[PDB]
Structure formats: C-alpha cells, structure tokens
Design a protein around this ligand. Sequence first.
Ligand SMILES: Cc1nc(Nc2ncc(C(=O)Nc3c(C)cccc3Cl)s2)cc(N2CCN(CCO)CC2)n1
Length: 244
Amino acid sequence: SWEIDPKDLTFLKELGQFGVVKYGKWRGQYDVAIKMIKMSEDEFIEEAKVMMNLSHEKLVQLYGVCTKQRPIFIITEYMANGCLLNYLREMRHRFQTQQLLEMCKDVCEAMEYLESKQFLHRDLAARNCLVNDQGVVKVSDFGLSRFPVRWSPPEVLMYSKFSSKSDIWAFGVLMWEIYSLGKMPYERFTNSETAEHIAQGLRLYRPHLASEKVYTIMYSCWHEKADERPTFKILLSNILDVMD
Ligand SMILES: Cc1nc(Nc2ncc(C(=O)Nc3c(C)cccc3Cl)s2)cc(N2CCN(CCO)CC2)n1
C-alpha cells in the first residue's frame, strides 16, 4: 500500500546523522532520498511503520517503502539544501531576520504535531533538521521515542526525566542556533562544565540578531521548572505574533 516498486528507483549519489541515505529518482520524475539500514531489519521496518502513521507539512514527507525484498528501503522527498546547521553557515551573509523567524516557525509546527501524537524527538537540534529548495525547514520522524548535553534540560541531565517539556528546552536551544547562524551553544565550556553551569542556572545569551521579543520566546523554553515552560502550541502562537 505504501509499497514502492524498487525497479522504479534510480540511484544518483550517496548523501552521517541521517544514516545511509542516497539521492535518487523515482519514476523518472521525482527527486527522492532513499534510506537503507546501517539497527536490525526488524527495527528498521518498525521505524518505517511509525513513518507510515505520521503526516505533517513540516515532517520530511514519506513517499513509500520497499520491504517485500532485500535490501529494505525507505523513500522520502529529497530536501535539496541538506542539513539546517550547514545551511545556516552556507547562507549566513544573506539571511534576513524574517527568514530566521520562519525557520523557527517551521520546526515549531512539526513539534506541536509530534507533541500531539505523544512522540518525543530527543535530539532536536539544527544538525538534525533538513531544508528544502524553498528554504522550508522540516524535521525527521524516523527514530522518535514514544542525551546531547547542550540541548538538554537539567531534569534530563540529572534524572532522565524526558517529556514534552524537555523537547521544549531543546527547541529553545535550536532557536538560539538559528539566530546565531549555527554557532555552538555554551562555546566557553566543556560538556561537563556545561552540565554543571546549567544546573547552577546558566542561560544562553541573546544572539546579536535576536530582538528582545524573539529572545523572550527562546528564554521561556529554559525555565528551571519544566511546568513553567510553554507548550509547542503556545510557542507557535508567540512566534506567529512576533512575526507580525
Ligand atoms: C544528508 C543530506 N541530505 C539531503 N537531503 C535529504 N532529503 C531527505 C533526506 C532523508 O534523510 N530522508 C529520510 C529518509 C530517506 C528516511 C527516513 C527519514 C528521512 Cl528524514 S536527506 C541533502 C544533502 N545535501 C548535501 C549538501 N548540499 C548542498 C546544497 O545546498 C546538497 C544537499 N545532504
């Protein structure tokens, strides 16, 4: 039903953090990314099934799967501009602040949807987002859960207390990364000293390109008390409001 005939794929080039992925052509027309296993065959297939059951404008769009033979493939839309972190660096001289805001908005819409479906991302960060030829940012729904020190809240670092609210903290850091055009958070510190200082209440300082209004949004994501952080729904509203 989601099954694709592998005969209609043409492999064009190998493309890290997104696994074993190649650029291809589907039915001579459609640019695709084609994923193969690097995980057991069983869990790769169950990942594909998670993807079959999730759908949003800001999740990388599943086109189909090949599971009736080996090797197993997962097929999605090709995101031509690659990973967000490298894209921020590539285009750093060009961005206008409205664009930075739309990128935050894109990822925030994906996360509101995933929150609503009781999935946690668990590595929400610029390196793990993809960008299409239109500049639209999307998130992967492969490998979701139902600890990157610089993107984790204290309750995760200390207690492995993962929740919507821990993805909220990471989304704040991702906002900081976007507004800093891909700089490393807490550059001054080792991972260990980062974990240390954050529990002591260290927060990321306002990037050059973030207005006070925008900073207020990312900063709300980092409340010590998880229950004082906003939901992705509230975040999107705040982001939309600051947009006009
Ligand atoms: C690593 C990488 N991927 C790119 N595009 C992708 N589109 C969709 C991808 C993907 O992984 N789908 C997927 C699958 C298949 C299964 C489960 C889950 C998912 Cl999300 S990977 C582009 C790219 N480029 C290198 C540098 N460039 C400079 C141009 O500005 C050209 C672009 N590099």
